């Protein structure tokens, strides 16, 4: 299952590693959270050294804003802190795209 983080200090934190965060902006009031939703589920699954986590953005809106984040689901992994790949429009296929790439 992925893990969905509190604070933009646990995104912030998480992201900072030396390792790949992916971690996906969400909200209560969208469909195509729900369909990536079971999928990036399948495919957090399938990250052994990459780690996956989904916030909602309606707590987290303050780090959404950091980031820009103007789409629900917005996929960005980042490394260093210094990001990795940004995918932004809901993205189950293309998450692999950047998550495949990247992880």
């Known amino acids: 299952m992925v893990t969905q983080f509190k604070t933009a200090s646990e995104f912030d934190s998480a992201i900072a590693q030396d390792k790949l965060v992916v971690v996906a902006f969400y909200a209560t009031w969208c469909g195509p959270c729900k369909m990536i939703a079971p999928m990036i589920e399948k495919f957090s699954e399938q990250y052994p050294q990459a780690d996956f986590y989904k916030?909602?953005?309606?707590?987290?809106?303050?780090?959404?804003q950091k980031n820009e984040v103007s789409a629900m689901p917005t996929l960005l992994l980042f490394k260093n802190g210094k990001e990795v790949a940004k995918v932004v429009g809901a993205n189950p296929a293309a998450i692999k795209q950047a998550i495949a790439a990247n992880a």
């Not at 916030?55 to 959404?64: K, M, N, Q, S």
């Open 55 to 64: 916030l909602d953005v309606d707590e987290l809106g303050d780090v959404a």
